[PDB]
Amino acid sequence: MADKELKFLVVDDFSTMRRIVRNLLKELGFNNVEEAEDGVDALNKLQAGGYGFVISDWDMPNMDGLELLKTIRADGAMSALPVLMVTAYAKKENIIAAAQAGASGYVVKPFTAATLEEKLNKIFEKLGM
Ligand SMILES: [Mn+2]
């Protein structure tokens, strides 16, 4: 995947968390990044079009990560959009629920740039990108 201009949507209800992920993406060479504060805000941005990757926190108010993921997967236009779920604590049940709903990957924060880069690269490879 050589498109460093792949457009990311970073979804988290904590501004600091969104800024962390944006800064790690910047470090890796991904500068085309937008932010959303919950699942509905995210869906509104996604319908504007152009997005290539979603990094979403699991626990958000109003519409959480799992529901956002399900909505994306049920959307004809965005059904195959890569979605990487972020959580503070890995739980078997959550990982399985996310997988059943079509998550592309799942990562525990806090994470480093190297860790994020590995998650991304493994998803690109899994998806044939
Ligand atoms: Mn949260």
Swiss-Prot record:
Which cofactor names does the annotation list? Mg(2+)
- What is the name of this protein? Chemotaxis protein CheY
Cellular compartment(s)? Cytoplasm
Highest taxon of the source? Bacteria
Q: Which residues carry the post-translational modification N6-acetyllysine, per the record?
A: K92, K109
4-aspartylphosphate-modified residues are D57
User: How is the cofactor bound, as the UniProt entry phrases it?
Assistant: Binds 1 Mg(2+) ion per subunit.
InterPro entries given for it?
A: CheY-like_superfamily, Sig_transdc_resp-reg_receiver, ST_Response_Regulator
Q: Name one GO biological process term.
A: aerotaxis
Chief location bin? cytoplasm
> Impact of changing K92R on the protein?
No effect on chemotaxis
Consequence of changing I95 to A/V:
Enhanced CW flagellar rotational signaling activity
Q: Which organism is it from?
A: Escherichia coli (strain K12)
